[PDB]
Amino acid sequence: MQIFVKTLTGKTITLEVEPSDTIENVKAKIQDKEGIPPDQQRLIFAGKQLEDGRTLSDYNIQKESTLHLVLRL
Amino acid sequence: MQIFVKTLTGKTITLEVEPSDTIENVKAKIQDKEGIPPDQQRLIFAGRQLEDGRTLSDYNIQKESTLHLVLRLRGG
Amino acid sequence: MQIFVKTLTGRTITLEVEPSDTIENVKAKIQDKEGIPPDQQRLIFAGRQLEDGRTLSDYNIQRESTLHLVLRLRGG
């Protein structure tokens, strides 16, 4: 499924992640496309933070759903 | 070293700790003075959140420094 | 007044500025000593970004305040 991730700076990026894929894998993909280490990423969907050991299905993320990516120290 | 913490109510509380004090350690002092639970205390310094396990030295906090105390709003 | 500028690792530099000093001017001081382009300088404080055309008085910054200097990369 094609997803759209947006950062606080407004930068948008299109990624291809499977519906049954874990957040851990998503972070790795972001590190590939953007170059931002997974341990520096923080995904927030609908105001709810996304944990690593969970699937996109656990957050009911539909197609074309805006995912927010902020900083994580 | 005296620091100034701005509460959510807009109250500037003055605390006395050491540079080697842990972030979460000072939180207890906020509860002893104001009564805000450390678990509800979200401290952010210059746009960057302070890790409870870190110290004031880690963020170069000195006397007269002001701390932004925000609400601990998590993913709901 | 002297202000503290924190990087990321821990290195904190101190620069003296005026109360009505513009952010773009402060960036120029950092570009001189540290040698970092102001266009790539992302100054964050209180959880918000400081605009170049704004003054220190605009954000209500006091003396002896530590700000965080982040890198402003322009990719996608």
Side-chain angles (χ1 to χ4, degrees):
Chain A
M1 198 181 72
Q2 206 164 89
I3 63 166
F4 298 94
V5 184
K6 295 199 173 193
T7 43
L8 60 102
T9 203
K11 193 269 183 279
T12 319
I13 174 68
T14 327
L15 290 98
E16 307 118 330
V17 187
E18 313 315 316
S20 14
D21 226 346
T22 20
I23 302 301
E24 294 175 24
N25 287 337
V26 185
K27 281 185 172 177
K29 299 179 184 293
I30 298 175
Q31 184 189 31
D32 202 275
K33 308 206 74 60
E34 277 301 284
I36 308 165
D39 248 32
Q40 201 177 273
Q41 300 171 28
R42 195 196 297 266
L43 284 166
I44 304 175
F45 177 67
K48 204 172 203 71
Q49 191 177 271
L50 314 184
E51 293 299 286
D52 284 275
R54 295 195 88 203
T55 358
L56 279 87
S57 24
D58 295 309
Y59 309 107
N60 47 86
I61 305 172
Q62 316 298 327
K63 177 178 64 97
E64 288 159 50
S65 305
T66 315
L67 293 171
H68 280 245
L69 185 69
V70 289
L71 188 67
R72 180 250 168 226
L73 296 158
Chain B
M1 180 191 64
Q2 297 198 331
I3 56 172
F4 302 104
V5 184
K6 255 297 206 296
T7 64
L8 301 117
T9 18
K11 178 181 177 177
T12 330
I13 55 172
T14 328
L15 300 168
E16 193 100 59
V17 291
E18 279 291 79
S20 18
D21 255 287
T22 7
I23 303 297
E24 66 171 342
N25 208 37
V26 189
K27 285 186 172 181
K29 277 181 165 165
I30 298 191
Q31 184 168 30
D32 265 311
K33 274 200 179 191
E34 191 49 27
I36 308 171
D39 183 56
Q40 198 205 94
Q41 296 180 33
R42 204 164 79 89
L43 303 161
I44 306 183
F45 193 68
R48 279 180 168 147
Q49 185 174 270
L50 310 182
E51 299 174 292
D52 290 66
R54 308 287 186 190
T55 57
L56 290 99
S57 14
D58 290 301
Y59 299 106
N60 196 86
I61 304 170
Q62 298 225 266
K63 205 170 175 188
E64 277 217 48
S65 293
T66 315
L67 235 181
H68 272 76
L69 175 65
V70 301
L71 186 75
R72 185 228 48 227
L73 181 67
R74 82 162 189 126
Chain C
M1 69 168 185
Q2 299 256 29
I3 55 168
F4 304 100
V5 186
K6 243 288 282 292
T7 40
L8 215 164
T9 44
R11 188 168 299 202
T12 318
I13 54 167
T14 319
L15 293 173
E16 200 146 44
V17 286
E18 301 310 301
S20 25
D21 255 349
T22 9
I23 300 300
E24 66 167 309
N25 186 274
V26 182
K27 289 184 175 184
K29 293 181 171 180
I30 306 174
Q31 187 194 33
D32 232 317
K33 187 182 184 68
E34 285 307 281
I36 306 173
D39 59 273
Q40 272 150 88
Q41 287 187 32
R42 175 183 267 131
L43 282 171
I44 307 177
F45 197 88
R48 295 174 178 126
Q49 184 184 268
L50 314 180
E51 290 299 302
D52 295 65
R54 304 295 187 192
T55 63
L56 308 181
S57 20
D58 269 283
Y59 295 104
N60 189 27
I61 311 170
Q62 297 179 33
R63 186 209 72 247
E64 288 175 305
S65 302
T66 315
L67 309 94
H68 280 276
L69 179 66
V70 201
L71 183 69
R72 193 171 82 148
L73 180 75
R74 182 184 162 217

